[PDB]
Every structure is written in structure tokens, then in C-alpha cells.
Amino acid sequence: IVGGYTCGANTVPYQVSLNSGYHFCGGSLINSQWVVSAAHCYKSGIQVRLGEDNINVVEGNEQFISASKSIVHPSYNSNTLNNDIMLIKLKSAASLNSRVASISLPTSCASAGTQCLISGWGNTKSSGTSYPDVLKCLKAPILSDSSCKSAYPGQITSNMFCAGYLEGGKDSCQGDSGGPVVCSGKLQGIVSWGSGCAQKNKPGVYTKVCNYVSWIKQTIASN
Numbered sequence: 559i560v561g562g563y564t565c566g567a568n569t570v571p572y573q574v575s576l577n578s579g580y581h582f583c584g585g586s587l588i589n590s591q592w593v594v595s596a597a598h599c600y601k602s603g604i605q606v607r608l609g610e611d612n613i614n615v616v617e618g619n620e621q622f623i624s625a626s627k628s629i630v631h632p633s634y635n636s637n638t639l640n641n642d643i644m645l646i647k648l649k650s651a652a653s654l655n656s657r658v659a660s661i662s663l664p665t666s667c668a669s670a671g672t673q674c675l676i677s678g679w680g681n682t683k684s685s686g687t688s689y690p691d692v693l694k695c696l697k698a699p700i701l702s703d704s705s706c707k708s709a710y711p712g713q714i715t716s717n718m719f720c721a722g723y724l725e726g727g728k729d730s731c732q733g734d735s736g737g738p739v740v741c742s743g744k745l746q747g748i749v750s751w752g753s754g755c756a757q758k759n760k761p762g763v764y765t766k767v768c769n770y771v772s773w774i775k776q777t778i779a780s781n
């Protein structure tokens with residue numbers, strides 16, 4: 559997260575860290591046995607780390623569970639990153655409490671101007687790598703479809719939305735991919751892609767979760 563602030567240990571109880579010996583992506587806990595992340599964060603050998611704050615020190619509240627299966631959306635296109643969503647079932651259910659809790663899925667999509675909370679352990683520099691140990695937060699608005707399309711012409715599908723600051727300086731970045739974009743208490747986006755980080759006129763692009771709600775529910779139901 560570039561230009562964000564420290565969230566405070568456990569103030570974002572649905573945030574998860576995807577680990578394969580190091581932190582590589584974020585995710586969102588939607589129920590005690592399922593997490594939603596981005597399809598491009600897929601890989602085998604994933605350990606989900608819940609109740610985390612400082613990813614390099616065990617401090618208490620952490621729960622490490624291995625993933626049972628990972629279900630990448632069947633129409634995921636790695637070239638366009640359209641349908642960039644993936645579900646991970648956990649080997650055992652997590653114990654939910656105030657420090658580890660799920661986030662709700664939306665009932666409607668959000669509109670431009672809605673303010674959302676984006677968090678993660680991603681890079682905090684737009685030029686060079688500087689990953690933090692603790693969870694960072696950024697409040698950002700959903701932009702209008704026209705501003706999104708003017709910024710990424712020919713690259714935005716109806717399953718994506720832009721959120722951020724066209725002036726640059728504040729944005730999500732590498733390490734943040736797969737994590738949550740929560741607006742009014744509902745999971746509306748998944749950190750997907752962007753051109754660099756916190757660059758002027760190049761906002762973050764997120765998977766539009768409201769278009770996958772029926773799929774998430776059907777898929778969890780049949781697995």
C-alpha cells in the first residue's frame with residue numbers, strides 16, 4: 559500500500575496473508591472455511607495465515623491453515639486478467655472471534671464516489687521494493703467508469719472497476735494483490751492490477767465482486 563497508514567493489529571479481521579514460505583498475496587475470509595483472492599495469485603502449496611498483523615513475528619492470534627483446494631474461475635484469462643477471482647477452501651475451519659471474522663458479500667454493486675478500505679502487506683514505494691511487516695490501510699474512492707476507461711483504454715471489462723487517486727501518491731501495489739476492497743462493510747473488490755503503483759492517471763483496477771456473488775455461492779455450495 560503506497561501512501562497508506564498502519565491499520566492497527568487486528569482491526570481488519572477478514573484480511574488473510576497467502577504464504578508459500580513468504581507472503582505473496584492477500585485474501586478475504588468469507589466464512590470459516592473459505593477465502594477469496596485473485597486467480598493470478600494461484601499456486602500450490604499455499605498456507606493461509608489469519609489473525610496476522612506483523613507477518614514476520616508470531617505475536618498471538620494467528621491461525622495457519624493449509625488450503626484444501628483452490629478454485630480459479632473457469633473463465634479466468636491470464637492475458638486480460640478478466641474474471642480474476644479464486645476461492646480457497648481451508649483444510650479445517652478457522653475459529654472466528656473478534657480478531658478473525660468473515661466479511662459479507664454485496665447485494666448490489668457500489669457506485670463511483672463510494673469510499674472503500676484497501677489493506678495489505680504490499681510494497682509501500684512506487685519506485686523500488688519496500689515491504690512492511692505490519693498491515694497497512696488506505697481509504698480510496700471507486701472512480702467513474704469513464705475515468706477508468708480513459709486511464710486504461712481497451713483494458714477494462716465489465717468485471718473490473720477502478721478506485722484510487724488520479725493525482726498519484728496513494729495506491730495498492732505488489733504484495734497487496736488478492737486482497738480486499740471493502741465498502742460499507744461489504745467485500746466489493748479484489749486487488750487485481752494497475753500500471754506501476756501510485757502513478758498519476760493510473761489508478762488501481764479491482765475485480766468487481768458483485769458480479770460473482772451467484773458463482774461464489776453456487777461453487778461453495780457444491781464443494
Ligand SMILES: NC(=[NH2+])c1cc2nc(-c3cccc(-c4ccccc4)c3[O-])[nH]c2cc1Cl
Nearest residue numbers: 599730731732735750751752754755762763
Ligand atoms: N493498484 C495498483 N497499481 C496495483 C499494482 C499491482 N502490482 C501488482 C503485482 C506486481 C507484480 C507481481 C504481483 C504478483 C502477483 C501474484 C503473485 C506474486 C506477485 C503483483 O500482484 N499487483 C498489483 C495490483 C494493483 Cl491493484
Ligand SMILES: [Ca+2]
Nearest residue numbers: 612615616617
Ligand atoms: Ca505475526
